[PDB]
Amino acid sequence: PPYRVLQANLQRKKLATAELAIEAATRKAAIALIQEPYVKGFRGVRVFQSTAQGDGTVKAAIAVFDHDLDVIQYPQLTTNNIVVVGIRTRAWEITLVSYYFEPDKPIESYLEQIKRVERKMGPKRLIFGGDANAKSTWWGSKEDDARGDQLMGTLGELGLHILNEGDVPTFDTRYQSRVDVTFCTEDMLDLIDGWRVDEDLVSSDHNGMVFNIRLQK
Ligand SMILES: [Cl-]
């Protein structure tokens, strides 16, 4: 009965999104928190995207593979960097968010978007996943850079808790790093487990991640 979630930065690779589809089928995943999707493989899959750019570029999206899962969109909260979507079942109602922060753009405006989502969406049932392009030992990075610090500060103000674990690089090229973060409201801990990094849930310099949403009660 666990709702499995996939988190991955596809880097606009046509192949990576094919791999993502294959992994979701295999793992029987219900959700995918995506960043940098390309522009096919997703048939009866509902996809919710962040505001598209002139050339059609979408930086974040949320794929729902579970055909019967109740979904609710929040156009007011979705931007060019984040997409917010609620999922509902008898057991609960969870607001999900997939985000992507450019490595060469001020993180400040993105932190405000996180705040806006948190306040205008209640202090409970929140799960965020994406590429923050920010380093912090709190999520296994080699060190705490200034971006990681700003993000951590924001997390602290919102009561958001890091789900990351281990030191497996979420980005490998050599050059390895952990810039992808997953965090949630306090109440979500106890409903989430199995957070791990698929050594290669894909093939686009970024490593996919996986975790479950249960009930335990
Ligand atoms: Cl790192």
Structural class: alpha+beta
Tell me the overall shape. Answer: globular
The helicity comes to 10-25%
> At CATH's second level, what is the architecture?
4-Layer Sandwich
When the domains are counted, the total is 1
Largest sheet: 6 strands, mixed
Query: SSE string, helix = H, strand = E?
Result: EHEEEEEEHEHEEEEEE
The CATH class turns out to be Alpha Beta
CATH fold naming: Deoxyribonuclease I, Chain A
Gap between N and C termini: 13 Å
| Chemical compounds bound to the protein | chloride ion
Q: Please give the radius of gyration in angstroms.
A: 16 Å
Strand order of the largest sheet: 3-4-2-1-14-13
Protein name: ORF2
PDB class: rna binding protein
Keywords: four-layered alpha/beta sandwich, RNA binding protein
Assembly: monomeric
Give a written overview of the molecule.
The protein has a single domain (1-217), classed as Deoxyribonuclease I, Chain A. 18% of the residues lie in helices and 31% in strands. The chain has three helices and 14 strands. It is globular and about 40 Å long. The structure holds chloride ion (CL). Residues 135, 141-142, 177-178 line the site of chloride ion.
Using brief descriptors, characterize the structure shown.
six-stranded mixed sheet, 18% helix, binds chloride ion, 217 residues, 14 strands, Deoxyribonuclease I, Chain A, monomer, 31% strand, globular, alpha+beta
Fold topology:
Elements: E1 3-9, H1 14-27, E2 31-35, E3 46-49, E4 60-64, E5 70-73, E6 82-88, E7 93-100, H2 108-119, E8 126-131, H3 146-158, E9 161-162, E10 171-172, E11 176-177, E12 180-184, E13 192-197, E14 209-213
Parallel strand pairs: 1-2, 7-8
Antiparallel strand pairs: 1-14, 2-4, 3-4, 5-6, 6-7, 8-12, 9-12, 10-11, 13-14
The structure holds chloride ion.
Protein name: ORF2
